[PDB]
Nucleic acid binder design. Structure first.
Ligand code: MG
Ligand code: ZN
Lengths: 150, 177, 83, 65
RNA sequence: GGGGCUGAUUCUGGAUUCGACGGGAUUUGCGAAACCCAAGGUGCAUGCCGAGGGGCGGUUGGCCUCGUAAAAAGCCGCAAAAAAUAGUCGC
RNA sequence: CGUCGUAGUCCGGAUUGGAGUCUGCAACUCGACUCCAUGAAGUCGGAAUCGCUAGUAAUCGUGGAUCAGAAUGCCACGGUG
């Protein structure tokens, strides 16, 4: 419905623990491009400086140059609007060993863009094997049980 | 009108002997007292205006006049002809009664009442001054009001300057600093 | 607590200083470093700057503190809310 | 004045904690029986120094000093 | 070189991005830094030349100290150079 | 034996103001005991989850070391079963 460019690869590439429905803060010519304008949310992650967890990786194509005064930067760091009450998770459980929180998807909420955030961590190519093995094994167990019980 | 005549018999003499006047009609006289209560939040809730009017009637028995908007500023999102606030005016007997009641119980009140501001004259000396809430008056019940409705009360006088108004209020025993 | 017959625990020096203050009639604060000392009725009417390591916090001792320790009026932690 | 639209107007005694008796007429309804007033407020009726004090000796200097 | 349609989540003239980030930094208690101005203490303090200053040098010359003039000591720079990056990813 | 009768209960004993006591030069931070007084929560508790196969589960009390005192922690002991 109101869904926009989403990053479903990061869901398989990470272990999503908790999610944040926090909003995004962006300048002109970009929110219009969210409707149509080729926004891409690849390589998305938070870049906490002090309390400024900007989303760094996103390429939103500028569709016009009619205002040829401001310099266009598709790789701009977008600000994020999150409650200070729930921002404690981000200044907390991020820098342990490898914890990250990445942008899973971006959609519309009554003419305002909301980017879904999620706390996760890497898999080192050995957790992926275990996940695939378990996903296949549950299916195989169900199939063999059904075949045996006819 | 007891305080009215009691203090009018002496302010005439004191001011006449102080300011070196030549007639009795040129002394600063209290024309009226004008008190309003801005309830501009009544845009969404009209019951606030009704409650403010009831509180004003309880403070001084009368019917508040609803002063509708005239310019309809967009900053506050108002439209002309809509109820925004309510005012009232007391003249003569009612003016003196309100003056007496207001000063007498408002002297012992909320926060460190070390007198009132001496620089609250509106250019000519009509002494507009504000009171924070309506629980000041024993007229208003303490634990029955929904909100607080203060009053920006102006003591509309005939004063030609600010020092004359100060002298008149001091004769009327005003809490000056 | 202490035995009723043992007596209070005012300091050798603190007593000398308060006696000096009371017959000299000086309004300057008297700084004290003791923290487990009790209170005597003769200090009523004097300002005592008691030391807890951070600042010499002042106490304008009333006529309503004799039978306790003067240190109850000066905490040592710094906290008036998590946020 | 208009008809019976304006509210109550009856004499009420403005008796405070101290010795003040008044014959105010207002709309509070019942008798005032109010509290500390301007005639007994520390603004000008004395008590310019008597606003706060260092306690008052009670049963503290008992059983040991 | 010209016209015509879109630059409008309403094409519905009234959107608290719910949230962080500037605002009179409007508001209620309050610490001389959210400040602050003749009296109890009675000591050698105010303008006085000052004295060059914490490990080192300097501050609007009266921000430290005095009593017959000085060690300067309350702040900045030399200093505290470790600030330099989500995750997965050659040994 | 009596007694209470299904109730925030004569259940439940915590927080509170004050009182002394043990104790160690000193219990405002920071002891424990006491008894008069307010008498909280809580009324078998989701998903989950742990321990036990016999004198053991489960209940009741006592004992021991640390240490001026400051055990629901620790280590032991038996009764019921
Ligand atoms: Mg010991
Ligand atoms: Zn009174």
């Amino acid at each position: 419905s109101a869904t926009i460019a989403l990053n479903k690869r990061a869901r398989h590439e990470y272990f999503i623990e908790e999610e944040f429905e926090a909003g995004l803060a962006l300048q002109g010519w970009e929110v219009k491009s969210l409707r149509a304008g080729k926004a891409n949310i690849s390589d998305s992650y938070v870049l906490l400086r002090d309390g400024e967890a900007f989303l760094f990786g996103a390429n939103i194509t500028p569709m016009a140059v009619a205002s040829t005064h401001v310099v266009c930067d598709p790789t701009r760091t977008r600000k994020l609007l999150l409650n200070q009450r729930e921002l404690d998770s981000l200044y907390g459980r991020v820098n342990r060993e490898g914890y990250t929180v990445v942008a899973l998807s971006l959609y519309w909420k009554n003419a305002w863009c909301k980017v879904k955030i999620g706390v996760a961590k890497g898999k080192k190519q050995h957790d992926k094997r275990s996940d695939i093995k378990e996903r296949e094994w549950q299916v195989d167990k169900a199939r063999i049980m059904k075949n045996a019980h006819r | 009108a007891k305080l009215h005549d009691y203090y009018k018999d002496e302010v005439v003499k004191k001011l006449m002997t102080e300011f070196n006047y030549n007639s009795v009609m040129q002394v600063p006289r209290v024309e009226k007292i004008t008190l309003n209560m801005g309830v501009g939040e009544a845009i969404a809730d009209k019951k606030l205006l009704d409650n403010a009017a009831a509180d004003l009637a309880a403070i001084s028995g009368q019917k508040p006049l609803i002063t509708k908007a005239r310019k309809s500023v967009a900053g506050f999102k108002i439209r002309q002809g809509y109820p925004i606030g309510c005012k009232v005016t007391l003249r003569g007997e009612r003016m003196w009664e309100f003056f007496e009641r207001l000063i007498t119980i408002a002297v012992p009140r909320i926060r460190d009442f070390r007198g009132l501001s001496a620089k609250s004259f509106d250019g000519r000396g009509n002494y507009s001054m504000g009171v924070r809430e309506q629980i000041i008056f024993p007229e208003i019940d303490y634990d029955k009001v929904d909100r607080v409705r203060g009053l920006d009360i102006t003591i509309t006088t005939t004063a030609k300057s600010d020092e004359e108004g100060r002298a008149l209020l001091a004769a009327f025993d005003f809490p000056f600093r | 607590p202490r035995s009723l017959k043992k007596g209070p625990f005012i300091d050798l020096h603190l007593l000398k200083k308060v006696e000096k203050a009371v017959e000299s009639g000086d309004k300057k604060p008297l700084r004290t470093w003791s923290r487990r000392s009790t209170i005597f009725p003769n200090m009523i009417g004097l300002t005592i700057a008691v030391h807890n390591g951070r600042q010499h916090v002042p106490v304008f001792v009333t006529d309503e503190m004799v039978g306790h320790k003067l240190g109850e009026f000066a905490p040592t932690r710094t906290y008036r809310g998590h946020a | 004045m208009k008809k019976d639209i304006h509210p109550k107007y009856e004499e009420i005694t403005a008796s405070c904690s101290c010795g003040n008796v008044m014959k105010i007429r207002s709309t509070v309804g019942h008798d005032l029986n109010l509290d500390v007033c301007s005639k007994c407020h520390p603004f000008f009726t004395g008590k310019q120094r008597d606003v706060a004090t260092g306690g008052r000796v009670d049963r503290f200097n008992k059983r040991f000093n």
